[PDB]
Ligand binder design. Structure first.
Ligand SMILES: [Ca+2]
Lengths: 223, 223, 223, 223
């Protein structure tokens, strides 16, 4: 996360890390058995890590659970990262407690100006590799489609929204992919892509989770 | 354009003029070698003029590039103007510069109420014929399907949308056909037809370019 | 390759394809037993295809040779694609002829403005997935370090260079990775990355091969 | 390690933890600047942690050094894990002493019956995700080729050996990968794979390090 702050101990307890083999992505817990992440972080076998804020050391709260099903969106497109969302079913349910909680699915789509929180263990800089051991947090607004489309002309689909700062300086970054953008208790975004990190007029692009409410429901109900 | 203004030197720089001695239609530059226009403006050999917004005062501003391929949509229907879109391949690439730029192809359709810009050297009047040497611009909204269908019952296909003002007064007009309707740096419409110009309850009808993103991409890729 | 042309029969005969699983990358033949490509195209076992022009049909000119060793650069960084170069040793020598030839390694780094040729069977479109059957070629210049750095702020290392057109319209694209940039008969770049394809102010970024001349010699001698 | 014991303080002072935020594989120090691990543990940037048996406590003895080169065996096959060995060059030399020492390379291959020591911070359970903070050790014998091949028909190559107990109960496990099997002061194996952990007739399979004495020696001498 570039220009964010370390999350408080009690914050962001829905946050998951995925060991997609040896690649790292974030994710978020939406029920005791299901995790959502970005489809570009796919691997057929993933270990989900929960209840962690400092990944370098033991805090006693950690839960490591392997996936049993990994379901990429049917129309995920690796060319432009359209429909960059995936669901992971855990082989055993997570034990919810203070450090491991679920985040609610969106009831509706959030509008521009809604303030949200993004979180992750990704890169702290847009010109060098600096990765944190504690989870970082960042408050940011959803930006208008006019802003989003003018920042990335011809690249933004209906399944994407931009969030962050056109002046740059604060953004999600590499390693945050798959992680949650939560607005008023609901999961509205999945960290997906951007050009560089925290550059002016290049805000982050997030998968628009409120477009997938039926798909996520349907998939959980019958898998 | 009826009821517009002279375009600011920087706006509408993606504007092309289709000529064969006379300039008869507009178009827009989507890459250094491709122009999109309206299929009803078809001629087998077209000289494309790029440059200065004033087509009379030349001082080496202009570039005149001949067409090497002109491809109408395969299902263009001249009775109702369905699929009124065409691509023109330039025999040499345009010099992109302060006068000449490209517009991006849409990755999503625009919604009713998005504000857009139309431009052209067409007729300034809904009563007389009076044509400008300086490119005119008009800011206009996309209208809802219900208003469009109310205005032209049984004549709007899914490949058409209405834009403009139901009160009349401001509209594109004859000679503007083939020209760009750009919303948030993206080509959303091609000027196609209407009943008169700037009449009450007869808004301009435009080819809905977002329905052609795959046909445009494939035709450019393969030719 | 976006905006390029079909390579002549006899040109680019140093071009290889790597069927690295279901990943396809380009590569180039530098001796009868060694191929150069991008480290991000790595797979443990690779089938190298040589002498191809049309990859969809049998041509009577192909040599299909399996790798015996695949050696990524020791400091390849998958996070920012620094040192994106790999050497592949063929399990038997290729027979060189009019269709299969080697390219020379660089005696020096090429300067801005040198005209080069990039080739590959990657995507023809920056707005859709359209892959060719026949090998495509594109003539392009090496750009200045300042243009490259302003196109990709904070991301360009000394082991990378940009080549192409700041105007967009012509570029290499997905699937061209690992393929050759040859300037005056010497291999100067390996197709590595870019944001989108053929967009304004986003030229391709290429691995700077002239930085690896001793590594390539030493590796070929020790393996 | 399933069924082992916490290593004595001087035991396994050649043990390395490979980290990328979290511990993900083991390794062993073979000189002040080189570490051997398993190629399936590859990451392009690794932090090597040496000198402390409790992975979660910064108690004192610890050296944390970043990798500068990561070199997988050139013919590593990810499919069957043949030649599952990798060398990591350190950016700074490690200080050797009572808590950090090197392990000798093998001068000949160990035979069946040789008793050896495996170590790691891997999973403690073959049915649960259970990871230790303190380094575990397990004394185990090399098994015959016949036992190895009847346990894993058609999957054992000449570059692999089995070690452990055919009755099960004691084995290395996930997270121990890349770590050392030392016999009579020399590194004979690298933890590579197995079916499950500590299962009956499914002993651990290890990379046969005595087959790579020349490759390790030339690679260290040319990089
Ligand atoms: Ca062929």
């Amino acid at each position: 996360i570039v220009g964010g702050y370390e999350c408080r101990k009690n914050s962001a307890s829905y946050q998951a890390s995925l060991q997609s083999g040896y690649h790292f992505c974030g994710g978020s817990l939406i029920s005791s058995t299901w995790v959502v992440s970005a489809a570009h972080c796919y691997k057929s076998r993933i270990q989900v890590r929960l209840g962690e804020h400092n990944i370098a050391v033991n805090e006693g709260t950690e839960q490591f659970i392997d996936s049993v099903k990994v379901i990429m969106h049917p129309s995920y497109n690796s060319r432009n990262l359209d429909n960059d969302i995936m669901l992971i079913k855990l082989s055993k349910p997570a034990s919810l407690n203070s450090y491991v909680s679920t985040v609610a699915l969106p009831s509706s789509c959030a509008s521009s100006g809604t303030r949200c929180l993004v979180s992750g263990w990704g890169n702290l800089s847009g010109s060098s590799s600096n990765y944190p051991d504690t989870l970082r947090c960042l408050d940011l607004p959803i930006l208008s489609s006019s802003s989003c489309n003018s920042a990335y002309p011809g690249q933004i689909t209906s399944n994407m929204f931009c969030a962050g700062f056109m002046e740059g300086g604060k953004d999600s970054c590499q390693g945050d992919s798959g992680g949650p953008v939560v607005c008023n208790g609901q999961l509205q975004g999945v960290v997906s892509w951007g050009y560089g990190c925290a550059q002016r007029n290049k805000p982050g692009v997030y998968t628009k989770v409120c477009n997938y409410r039926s798909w996520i429901s349907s998939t959980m109900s019958s898998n």
